[PDB]
Symmetry: C3
Subunit: 282 residues, 3 copies
Amino acid sequence: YTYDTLQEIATYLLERTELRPKVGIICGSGLGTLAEQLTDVDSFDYETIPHFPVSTVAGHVGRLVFGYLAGVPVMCMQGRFHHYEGYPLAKCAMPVRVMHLIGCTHLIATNAAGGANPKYRVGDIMLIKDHINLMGFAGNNPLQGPNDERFGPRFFGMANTYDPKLNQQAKVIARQIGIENELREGVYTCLGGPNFETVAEVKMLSMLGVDAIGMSTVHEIITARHCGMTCFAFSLITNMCTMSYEEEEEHCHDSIVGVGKNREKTLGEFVSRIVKHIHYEA
Amino acid sequence: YTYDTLQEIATYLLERTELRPKVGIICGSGLGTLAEQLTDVDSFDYETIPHFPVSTVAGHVGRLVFGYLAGVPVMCMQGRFHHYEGYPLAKCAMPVRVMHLIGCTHLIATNAAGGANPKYRVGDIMLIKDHINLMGFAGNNPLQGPNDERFGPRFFGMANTYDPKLNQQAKVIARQIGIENELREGVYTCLGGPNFETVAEVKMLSMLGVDAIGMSTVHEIITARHCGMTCFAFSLITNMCTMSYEEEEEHCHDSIVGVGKNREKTLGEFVSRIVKHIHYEA
Amino acid sequence: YTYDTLQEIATYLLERTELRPKVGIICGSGLGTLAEQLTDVDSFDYETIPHFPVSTVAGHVGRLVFGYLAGVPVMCMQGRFHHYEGYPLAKCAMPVRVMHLIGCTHLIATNAAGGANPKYRVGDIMLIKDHINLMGFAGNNPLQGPNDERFGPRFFGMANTYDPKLNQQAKVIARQIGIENELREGVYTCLGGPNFETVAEVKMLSMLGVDAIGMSTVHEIITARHCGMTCFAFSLITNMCTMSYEEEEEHCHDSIVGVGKNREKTLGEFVSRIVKHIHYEA
Ligand SMILES: O=c1[nH]cnc2c(C[N@@H+]3C[C@H](CO)[C@@H](O)C3)c[nH]c12
Ligand SMILES: O=c1[nH]cnc2c(C[N@@H+]3C[C@H](CO)[C@@H](O)C3)c[nH]c12
Ligand SMILES: O=c1[nH]cnc2c(C[N@@H+]3C[C@H](CO)[C@@H](O)C3)c[nH]c12
């Protein structure tokens, strides 16, 4: 994906919707119903958009929806792309660069995750304060290759990547809507997958300071920071990681999506208030 | 590798052998003599099987041996494929899909490993109870890409991957044949190699909970679990990891292969009786 | 990059300089002025060398300089190649195989790094005593693929990779030139980049025993060891890693390169005394 190609995707969309969102939202496993709450919608199935990858995972509808979320224009990825589907991280992160070119100044990244922190409960929302990019340590980063200064600088720091003020405002909101007890804040990691983690892997990740284990988001976030966007992200805790050889393990994708589906009203209200906050501060 | 190509390999072999084994065995460095103890054998050089990779590593003979191991039909990879040879993990693990299509319900994977646990000794057999897939964390996984459901599900859990009942029976067997003082049980990891680990690496890997350090196996067993195969695995400790800047280090592939070669009797007997337990249990 | 191609490159240079150096030097970020202290130079822009990558990083000049360092013939990479540029590790490390083919017995690898050890100070030189190759754990190694025995063995051990005796002489030189308090010794790791590390990543890397965090060197050293070369390496600490969500982060490539430029006299004297030691001892 060159700059020119990405700008063709952006123009393609800007000619076909009048909406000019300042916020992009990526909906993960069981979070796709965020997109169903928008009004005055212009919708584009991924398989119809030039150069666009398709979502092959169940519960990822595969649709870019422009609409109003409680009156605020947003761009919504209803469905994400994952490295385990065979997509390089630059390709999974490509919509973030499209968002940036469309004029989004903010990225809200959303995902399902397993709770490696044993104090978490299924159904909790964990604010991502930080991440550990293991893929990146190994050389697998979406920014590898020639750098285009029209997007951003060759090198950049990660301080405040997960915006501290939006994280603090999300705590204020959680308490307004009565979900503070189901609200966490901690560290996310993105692993290859598609298999889930062994007991030894979960022990190692957790001792290194990981609270939530998923398979996305980090490379999306790094692409967003590269081009100057403000990021906010959260994990819905859809299952607890297996902590012992003694525990019965029942990890199931359908149940994992189910967790989010059953919380669609609360998630929608939560994201809706975050977006409201971003809009009024601007 | 498509399901159709793999089925073609399976059909090619099944047309050239009368044997219908329920157990695939993979022999690692110094374990190649397991194949030599089979009776009434149909043997296939890797060079001659369609689409098959070749063993380039010393002590890896490079042939697929169907035969009887104490009267039980087995198929045996005499020599394996390593990622450091330049094969993608899916290519290294492809024989597991062939075993499955042939009708193997069980995979026994064997390997050489450096002992990172300083309680171990050269010549110990360490039952693999669990692994840590650092390659998979970084996105290097044999299941990356489109998922064929004729093999297995998109996602799956890792609990009980190294079958607990078979590890238990291996402890029983170790007692029967006098080797309980050379029998450990612990956590394996598969590194890229082909260089051996530095002192700082070994310390980091111990602290994360690794007992045995190798360069194979993990993706073979991930491929088997995806197929729904039951897995049993062990490492022969062929050398102790260097643990200080003061220890003299003498890691040598020829010596490493020799550790297994000098234990062929015991290894054959140990593996033969696990296979026997599997046969009797169906 | 085959042996024959590498010999093409070696022969190309050997035809165009009469210098026969025994020591190769790679200059990293802020260390390029080392090449400027050479006398009687034959200089080659990377652009003009057959099959050579080019340096795209600010402050990496991109010239191979054959010259005298205080009377000792050296071969000096003024600027290097990084994986985040899009170069595979074997391509970043390729100039090390050329140095060997030319007759270099020693590699001096220098880099800039972030101080993860909080007792380090900006401007310190950390001798590399060891490294943790996280790229290699995942399978990203310059030696992956067929092995040519004309360079070295399939497998080899890492003990004393960073030469203990040269590290000892460095400590003696440090006191001779008045920089003993600014001399450290510890463990280096090579991350993919190009972004710098999160707070959570720096914490995890410290915990695992890393003192200095960089993006180069490790694969150059592994290639050198493969060839049988003696290796000496150090990091100039150009910035402290961010260790808290409360500190102000000002990671800047221009400043980083500036730390070395501001120390060119010292760096040159230090390196010049090491080469003088290698030369006398031989
Ligand atoms: O326990 C886990 N480990 C890794 N990822 C997840 C996720 C996140 N998603 C959900 C989905 C498979 O259910 C895949 O895209 C990763 C939920 N739970 C876990
Ligand atoms: O100390 C070790 N580190 C990593 N792997 C091994 C192995 C396993 N095999 C042995 C073989 C090189 O001797 C290569 O295929 C990996 C034995 N000892 C060690
Ligand atoms: O804090 C750090 N983290 C990772 N690498 C470096 C380096 C080494 N170089 C410097 C350069 C970016 O300034 C890139 O080539 C990596 C200096 N400081 C840091």
